Every structure is written in C-alpha cells, then in structure tokens.
Curated annotation (Swiss-Prot):
One of its GO terms (biological process) is one-carbon metabolic process. It comes from Mycobacterium tuberculosis (strain ATCC 25618 / H37Rv). This is Dihydrofolate reductase. Pfam families: DHFR_1 (PF00186). Keywords: NADP, One-carbon metabolism, Oxidoreductase. Inhibited by isoniazid metabolites. The prodrug isoniazid is metabolized to isoniazid-NADP adducts that inhibit the enzyme at subnanomolar concentration. The gene is folA.
C-alpha cells in the first residue's frame, strides 16, 4: 500500500519559493494520524523544507529520495530510487511535487486537504498530482481555520 498525503490550494499549488504558501496548523493532527508509526517517503527538497527541530519526523521512518549518492540527512534513510524507497508494506509519500508525480502510479490512497485560498498557479510552483477517474473519493465538510481559511478533507482510493 502506497498512499499520498498533501494539502493544496484549490488551484493545485502545494509549494512556492521552497515553502508552503499558507498557514494551516489545523492540518497537523490529521497528517500525524495518517502517518504515525509508518514509513514516510519524501523528495530531498521536502526534507530541506522541514525545520531542524522537526526533522526527522518522529514516530515515523523517514526515507529521503535523492540522486546525490552521498547526500546527508541525519535520522533519515537516503535512497537513490523510488523502488528502494517503497519497501515497507504501508508507505505514505509526503511530497513534494516531483515525488508525488513519481509515486502516483504506485498509490492506491490519497488523503488531500483542500485550502480555500485564491492562489493562481505561477511558473515554477510545486503542484499537486491530478486525480483521474480511476479514483473514488469522499469529500468532507468545510471547516474554518484559525487563520481564516476554509479547508476540507478528501479521502480517495482505488483498488
Ligand atoms: N503542500 C504540501 O502538502 C506539501 C508541500 N511541499 C512543498 O513542495 C515543494 C517541494 O517540492 P518539489 O517538487 O520542488 O521537490 P521534492 O519532490 O520535495 O524533491 C525533489 C528532489 O527529490 C529528488 N528526486 C526527484 N526525483 C527523483 C528520482 N527520480 N530519483 C531520485 N531522486 C529524485 C531530487 O533530489 P536531489 O536534487 O537531492 O537529487 C529532487 O531535487 C516545496 O515548496 C515544499 O514546501 C512539500 C510537501 C507537502 C507537505 O509538506 C505536506 C504534506 C502533507 N500535509 C502538509 C504538508
């Protein structure tokens, strides 16, 4: 089982300038619930985007994909290919744009948070993968964040 988990603006943007272009701390508990106790896989840039105090993400085996055969990530497993990354029975891919696109064909679950923020795509942004008709989904109810942003959860699956 490979699952993907991300948060996106309605437009599809998930990343800009090396970070996430909104604040949504309400997202954190759901991300932990899905991922805790499991192997998580991320691209090298996503690892770089984690603050030092939070990386590796605790309670999860952190696996970092990089083409640098020598790359350095304390508390994480650096691998050079997605096949090497994917060895655990249940794996959650936690980004970024490159790695979601790489892992999508392997995935049978996505847990998506949609952020109701007006954020037109710009060139060079990180973007969420598009889910086609092979996926079936349930849409959750909108909630307001302490930031003022509405957000909602989708759970998608395909067998
Ligand atoms: N909104 C989001 O949900 C996310 C945004 N981000 C954002 O995406 C952006 C990073 O995505 P990118 O597409 O630029 O990069 P990555 O996919 O993380 O890494 C690409 C790197 O992986 C590596 N890579 C890519 N393809 C391969 C490959 N085929 N083989 C080996 N390595 C590969 C390469 O590494 P090296 O340069 O060290 O060689 C490549 O440069 C940042 O803005 C980041 O803040 C990342 C994860 C999530 C995320 O943090 C997250 C997930 C769930 N809930 C809340 C947040």
């Amino acid at each position: 089982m490979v699952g993907l988990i991300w948060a996106q603006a309605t437009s599809g943007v998930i990343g800009r300038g090396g970070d996430i272009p909104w604040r949504l701390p309400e997202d954190q508990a759901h991300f932990r619930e899905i991922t805790m106790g499991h192997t998580i896989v991320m691209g090298r840039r996503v690892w770089d985007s984690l603050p030092a105090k939070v990386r590796p993400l605790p309670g999860r085996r952190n696996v970092v994909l990089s083409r640098q055969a020598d790359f350095m990530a304390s508390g994480a497993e650096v691998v050079g290919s997605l096949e090497e990354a994917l060895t655990s029975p249940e794996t959650w891919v936690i980004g970024g744009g490159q790695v979601y696109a790489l892992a999508l064909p392997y995935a049978t679950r996505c847990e998506v948070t949609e952020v109701d923020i007006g954020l037109p795509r710009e060139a060079g942004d990180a973007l969420a993968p598009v889910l086609d008709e092979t996926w079936r989904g349930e849409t959750g109810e909108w909630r307001f964040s302490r930031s003022g942003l509405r957000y909602r959860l989708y759970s998608y699956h395909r067998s």
